[PDB]
Design a protein around this ligand. Structure first.
Ligand code: SRM
Ligand code: SF4
Ligand SMILES: [K+]
Length: 453
């Protein structure tokens, strides 16, 4: 069961309702936060009455949860951008393949825009959103050894004033709907359609249908994709506490009652929560007077246990035991794998650094390994394809470095590479960029043509 939850914003009342159901009506008893800012129950022995009772709904609807940057540096931009993610979501509510959409607030690419079909990058002037740059065609799914499939980054179409948002959203969806491949579902996705007809052809059709002309792209840059773990000052006297939740798996573990702690917080919390695209949770809108109260609960429940910057920037998909398409472990492999990476980082004197590292259980790519600096793609039990060369902001697809290897083999490759980066990197140079500059891996410049060797 997966909930429709635009922007990952969930009230404390809704949380308490899902917390109950998770504990009493599912085999696993957990709340699993997903990387598309929503949650999932595993092993449901219905849920819809419960969701519906607190104003929630579980999603042939070929649409997925609409994402929205969760913790913007310019705190006041969230409300507006959130409002638009909600409107786009409702507007699109009832395609060849599933359609994924996001609303992004630079300089954060926490939502990983390049893994999505349609992206609206917020352009603000004087603290007010004035429009969006539209990027179309991202998608990460591939099939092992099938060179007709590929991960692709989204292409820039142009800028549009706020007023044309919904018309443009509708036009992209309908154009993809009509032009999408009408036979092979593995080529139905927008990324394939764009490559077949061309960005300019697709863009012109969208302008025709929307009844507008795109203006030139407005300047925007991204500085990162991680969450802002800990306390950050929001608007007024409000604060936001982002809690790192390993694999987004919320359950009470011996001596770390993560699930109970969150329930205790939801009961005294003023504002609401925000599920992030990094499978974490933000206790949003905490008045200064309440910080100590919230921090005490989070602290004692083990929700604020300090982890390395590395662990904070690593991600894995669900995979076994519940995913029927799983080829190798991901969520259950990540904790001990990062324990090992942490050692490597310490051994090389880069314990304060991080490499965006992701593990996906099979090539479908839910863990977003195809946008990581170091991506692990499951191929069989205990075996993964190792990809290197993405960047910190997620605008480049990592090329396959080694194929079908085991963890010990992976660790050995990384020990050597991290060693070289540690000593040969320029001031503030990321790992992915380093492997490409140092000639360790050739960059993927045009995925549709040079992703596969
Ligand atoms: C929970 C999540 C991974 C996580 O650990 O967070 C996940 C889990 C699953 N995904 Fe996904 N996907 C998740 C994000 C994505 C991502 C990343 C993203 O959207 O940001 C992708 C890659 C980008 C992309 O779409 O290209 C992704 C691409 C897929 C695909 C391949 C789609 C394709 O176009 O080929 C499938 C399989 C399919 O639909 O054929 C899939 C299928 C599935 C299913 C439902 C398996 C199935 O079809 O029966 C997995 C359920 C496993 C389980 O036991 O819970 N999932 N999946 C994410 C659910 C997000 C959500 O709330 O909607
Ligand atoms: S990438 Fe594969 S194994 Fe992981 S959750 Fe998605 S479908 Fe399952
Ligand atoms: K996490």
């Amino acid at each position: 069961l997966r909930c429709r939850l635009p922007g990952g914003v969930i009230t404390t009342k809704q949380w308490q309702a899902i917390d109950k159901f998770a504990g009493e009506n599912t085999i696993y008893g957990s709340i699993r936060l997903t990387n598309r800012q929503t949650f999932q129950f595993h092993g449901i022995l219905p849920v819809h009455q419960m969701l519906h009772s607190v104003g929630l709904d579980a999603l042939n609807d070929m649409n997925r949860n609409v994402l929205c940057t969760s913790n913007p540096y310019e705190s006041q931009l969230h409300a507006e951008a959130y409002e638009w993610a909600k409107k786009i979501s409702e507007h699109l509510l009832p395609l060849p393949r599933k359609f994924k959409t996001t609303v992004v607030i630079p300089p954060q690419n926490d939502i990983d825009l390049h893994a999505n079909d349609m992206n609206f990058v917020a352009i603000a002037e004087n603290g007010k959103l004035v429009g969006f740059n539209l990027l179309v065609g991202g998608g990460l799914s591939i099939e092992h050894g099938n060179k007709k499939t590929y991960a692709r980054t989204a292409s820039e179409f142009g800028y549009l004033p706020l007023e044309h948002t919904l018309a443009v959203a509708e036009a992209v969806v309908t154009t993809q709907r009509d032009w999408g491949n009408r036979t092979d579902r593995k080529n139905a996705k927008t990324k394939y359609t764009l490559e077949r007809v061309g960005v300019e052809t697709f863009k012109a059709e969208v302008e025709r249908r929307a009844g507008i002309k795109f203006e030139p792209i407005r300047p925007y840059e991204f500085t990162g994709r991680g969450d802002r773990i800990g306390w950050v000052k929001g608007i007024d006297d409000n604060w936001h506490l982002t809690l790192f939740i390993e694999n987004g798996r919320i359950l009470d573990y011996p001596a770390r009652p993560l699930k109970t702690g969150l329930l205790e917080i939801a009961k005294i919390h003023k504002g609401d929560f925000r599920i992030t695209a990094n499978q974490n949770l933000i206790i949003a809108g905490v008045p200064e007077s309440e910080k100590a109260k919230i921090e005490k609960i989070a602290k004692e429940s083990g929700l604020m246990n300090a982890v390395t910057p590395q662990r904070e920037n690593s991600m894995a998909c669900v995979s076994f035991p519940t995913c029927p398409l799983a080829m190798a472990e991901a969520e259950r492999f990540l904790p001990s794998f990062i324990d090992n990476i942490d050692n490597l980082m310490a051994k090389h004197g880069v314990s304060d650094e991080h490499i965006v590292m992701r593990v996906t259980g099979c090539p479908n790519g839910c863990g977003r390994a195809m946008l990581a600096e170091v991506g692990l793609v499951g191929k069989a039990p205990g075996r993964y394809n190792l990809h290197l060369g993405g960047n910190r902001i997620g605008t480049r697809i990592p090329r396959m470095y080694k194929e079908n290897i085991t963890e010990p083999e992976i660790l050995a490759s990384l020990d050597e590479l991290i060693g070289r980066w540690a000593k040969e990197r320029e001031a503030g140079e990321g790992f992915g960029d380093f492997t490409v500059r140092a000639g360790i891996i050739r960059p993927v410049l045009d995925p549709a043509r040079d992703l596969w060797d």
